[PDB]
């Protein structure tokens, strides 16, 4: 009924990788049908990612257009779930005026390694009942109150200055960090909310101990740590993206500090997946960097997809199998996708129609499957929604073959548009 | 302002936010508070 930011996309119906605990792909499960061998390979790579033992293993998904490479990648991301970094980028996203392709690849890698840092804080929280005359070197008392306890604290000069600077007032809930002596006001008293209202927020009194030990686990990525340490207010670069070529020395220091934390049990490293769709758009410089960025102990699992044939590598005149240099192809395992039979195309169309919430007659399914086999899978997917709209304009509940023919005549595929163009090619600009 | 995420960095932590979400004055108690009289029963200092 209500529209969210997420709605029906190309891959929204892929809920996961439909394979058993034996990694045997079911014919149709979790919104993914066919591509049995590639789904089994994706399951093996997914288990590799979940074990997180082997660093910098590269997998390439190759095959013809419309053969499911991004579908398999999204299924892997959906089986992996959150809290394991799955970074998805296009090969075009590394060409930036901000930073070098090498730097962009480095950031993408550091974004696929997740760090869970835990700390103990030992804070004091309570509703303040009183702050009395400090006039003497100033000395004062602070009365804090929970629903079960209240205590009186003798304030030193620094704490008095902090309390007077925050204008802490009787009847507000503060938390005091004992290690730092830091005062954080989080709300006003529960004796009013009683005629007020402003930027203020109203909180009810803490219950239990005034002083509490607390374990907080912070989830970050290596890139986040890098940009936090890049400059004094560098955390703002997590928003603006104005990162600008983080220093290598900072990254080495961060790697060492993270290793220290992992030995101390403070930090837990969750290695993830970097997905580069359209990896044929990378330069030979970028592939050269990937060769070595994978050989780091902190490198994630790299998944790349490309539909290229035997093409020239970008930035070079050299013909390589996937537009990728042969030295990098030796460093990865290639998953190949077989084209789709009539049954597989029909099943895919059925799942897409389920996603769209559109009902189609069996004759319509036969005709649309034949259209997809003739033209392409994506064109059939789009005809699904087009025919649903044409059916609704007709005040019908089920999409008939007539509606599919209507949308087929309204919307052309690449071949028919190319033909109509070709017979009129002198009217089109530049051939 | 509810879409101002950058400003909130200067203000609170996530533990503080979870605390606040658990501790936000419930609606019923707000009317209880605005009805009842002031409970000014401070026992005053004793120094025992």
């Amino acid at each position: 009924d209500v529209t969210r930011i997420e709605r029906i996309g190309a891959h929204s119906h892929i809920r996961g990788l439909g394979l058993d605990d034996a990694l045997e792909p079911r014919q149709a499960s979790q919104g993914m049908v066919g591509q049995l061998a590639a789904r089994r390979a994706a399951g093996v790579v997914l288990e590799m990612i979940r074990e997180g033992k082997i660093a910098g293993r590269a997998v390439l998904i190759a095959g013809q257009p419309g053969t499911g490479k991004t579908a398999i990648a999204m299924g892997m991301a959906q089986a992996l779930g959150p809290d394991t970094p799955f970074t998805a980028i296009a090969g075009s996203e590394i060409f930036s005026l901000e930073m070098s392709k090498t730097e962009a690849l480095t950031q993408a890698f550091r974004r696929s390694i997740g760090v869970r840092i835990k700390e103990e804080t030992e804070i004091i929280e309570g509703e303040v009942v009183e702050i009395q005359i400090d006039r003497p070197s100033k000395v004062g008392k602070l009365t804090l109150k929970t629903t079960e306890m209240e205590t009186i604290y003798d304030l030193g000069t620094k704490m008095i200055e902090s309390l007077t600077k925050d204008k802490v007032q009787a009847g507000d809930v503060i938390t005091i960090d004992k290690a730092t002596g830091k005062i954080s006001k989080l709300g006003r008293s529960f004796t009013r909310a009683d005629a007020m209202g402003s930027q203020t927020k109203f909180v009810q009194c803490p219950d239990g101990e005034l002083q509490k030990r607390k374990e907080v686990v912070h989830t970050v990525s290596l890139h986040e740590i890098d940009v936090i340490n890049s400059r004094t207010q560098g955390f703002l670069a997590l928003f603006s993206g104005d990162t600008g070529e983080i220093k290598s020395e900072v990254r080495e220091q961060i790697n060492a500090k993270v290793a220290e934390w992992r030995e101390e049990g403070k930090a837990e490293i969750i290695p993830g997946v970097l997905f580069i769709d359209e990896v044929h758009m990378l330069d030979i410089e970028s592939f050269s960097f990937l060769n070595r960025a994978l050989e780091s102990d902190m490198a994630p699992v790299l998944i790349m997809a490309t539909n290229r044939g035997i093409t020239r590598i970008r930035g070079t005149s050299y013909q390589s199998p996937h537009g990728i240099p042969i030295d990098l192809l030796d460093r990865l395992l290639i998953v190949s996708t077989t084209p789709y039979s009539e049954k597989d195309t029909k099943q895919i169309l059925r799942i897409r129609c389920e996603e769209e919430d559109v009902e189609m007659s069996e004759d319509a399914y036969t005709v649309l499957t034949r259209i997809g086999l003739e033209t392409s899978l994506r064109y059939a997917i789009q005809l699904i929604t087009a025919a649903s709209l044409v059916c609704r304009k007709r005040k019908g509940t089920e999409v008939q073959v007539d509606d599919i023919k209507r949308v087929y005549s309204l919307f052309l595929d690449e071949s028919r548009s190319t033909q109509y163009m070709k017979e009129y090619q002198d009217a089109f600009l530049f051939n | 302002s509810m879409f101002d995420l950058i400003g909130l960095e200067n203000k609170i932590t996530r533990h503080e936010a979870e605390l606040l979400s658990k501790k936000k004055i419930p609606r019923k108690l707000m009317e209880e508070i605005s009805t009842s009289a002031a409970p000014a029963a401070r026992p005053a200092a004793a120094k025992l």
Partner: peptide, 28 residues
């Protein structure tokens, strides 16, 4: 009710990172 709704809003929003995370991620 207006006070409750606005206070609900202001008490429900979590920071993306927060001071503690930025402080613990700093190098010495």
């Amino acid at each position: 009710d207006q006070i409750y709704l606005v206070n609900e809003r202001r008490c429900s929003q979590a920071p993306v990172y927060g001071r503690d995370l930025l402080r613990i991620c700093a190098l010495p």
